[PDB]
């Protein structure tokens, strides 16, 4: 999971 | 927004759609190419091809279970492009590049047409 | 094999599937949650959720145009997860995390359950 | 395009  | 994003989600979705295609699950159309038949999902075909997008948004054709392609279309070129739609992988070779580019132009798959043009230009 | 791969293909496919959902094109099922209705594509739901995969591979249920979820399921939690299925983006917030995790457990969306568990553990 |  990432900060888009 | 303040969303988080799962990097592998899109790839995992496409991998699962290809598994459904392999097992012939919920396929809703047959594409006929020079008497070679290919089962697929209308939505995946529309998501990948400007031609299928136009066909399946047409009020009469959206309801067809069989689509016949132009007789000039090569079944192998179509098969390679159908595999690309469901995997992101294109089996481009010296022996198939002309048929693949011609099929991609007809199907309106601009990114494929682009890489074929570049690979042909490198060989001249 | 000797394939080339188009990096953005899977993401472009999912973006187009979400555009078809927005325009209600070729959606083939209604998911009913506490009298809130959500139109979707069966194949995308199956590609994202172990529950929908099991439902739409069942010989009787594969033919249903309406699916009713368990009354304990929160419509907002479902809406957030449906958006995630079609975009890879999860709108996870302090005010919805419990409903989102409970819905993801029911839908069998293991990666979502995982990030909810981790976000809850960080707040304790 | 890349070599996967
Ligand atoms: O090269 C290409 C690839 C491609 C895909 C589509 N598909 C869609 N476009 C927009 N909203 C939904 C969909 Cl399904 C249309 C044109 C082209 N041209
Ligand atoms: O967490 C999850 C996400 C998920 C998706 C599916 N889908 C499929 N699996 C295998 N072949 C085809 C499909 Cl469509 C099954 C289980 C789970 N569990
Ligand atoms: Cl393309
Ligand atoms: Cl997930």
């Amino acid at each position: 999971w990432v900060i888009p | 927004d303040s969303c988080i994003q799962f990097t592998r989600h899109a790839s995992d979705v496409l991998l699962n759609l290809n598994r459904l295609r392999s097992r012939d699950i919920l396929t809703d159309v047959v594409i006929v190419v020079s008497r070679e038949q290919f089962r697929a999902h209308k939505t995946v075909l529309m998501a990948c091809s400007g031609l299928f997008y136009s066909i399946f948004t047409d009020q009469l054709k959206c309801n067809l279970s069989v689509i016949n392609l132009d007789p000039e279309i090569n079944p192998e070129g179509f098969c390679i492009l159908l595999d690309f739609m469901y995997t992101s992988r294109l089996n481009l070779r010296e022996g198939n590049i002309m048929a693949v580019m011609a099929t991609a132009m007809y199907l309106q798959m601009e990114h494929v047409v682009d890489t074929c043009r570049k690979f042909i230009k490198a060989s001249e």
Side-chain angles (χ1 to χ4, degrees), chain A, chain B residues 1-58 60-109 111-124:
Chain A
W1 293 85
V2 301
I3 301 304
Chain B
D1 220 298
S2 58
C3 288
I4 56 173
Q5 177 194 72
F6 192 65
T7 304
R8 297 291 294 156
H9 184 70
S11 182
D12 287 352
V13 165
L14 193 68
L15 180 70
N16 283 339
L17 292 178
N18 195 37
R19 285 165 177 173
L20 295 181
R21 180 175 68 117
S22 289
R23 304 173 71 219
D24 198 37
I25 299 163
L26 292 201
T27 50
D28 49 15
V29 74
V30 177
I31 307 304
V32 180
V33 189
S34 294
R35 292 198 191 92
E36 294 251 65
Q37 292 188 6
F38 303 89
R39 295 211 51 104
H41 302 97
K42 283 179 195 184
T43 59
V44 174
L45 294 183
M46 297 167 82
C48 298
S49 152
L51 187 67
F52 289 124
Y53 176 70
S54 292
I55 294 164
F56 300 121
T57 54
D58 173 85
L60 277 176
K61 299 185 191 79
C62 67
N63 293 143
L64 294 177
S65 60
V66 180
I67 302 295
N68 303 297
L69 303 193
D70 185 291
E72 284 285 286
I73 303 304
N74 177 254
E76 189 192 30
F78 186 75
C79 185
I80 288 155
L81 289 175
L82 184 62
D83 282 347
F84 169 75
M85 291 187 195
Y86 280 86
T87 67
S88 312
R89 301 167 61 87
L90 185 71
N91 182 24
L92 199 57
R93 301 172 60 85
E94 186 183 47
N96 68 31
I97 187 151
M98 299 313 286
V100 171
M101 188 169 78
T103 313
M105 283 170 69
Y106 170 76
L107 293 182
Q108 300 164 34
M109 293 174 74
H111 293 300
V112 176
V113 178
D114 187 53
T115 197
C116 286
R117 281 221 246 270
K118 290 188 202 293
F119 274 49
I120 289 157
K121 198 193 170 189
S123 279
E124 78 187 20

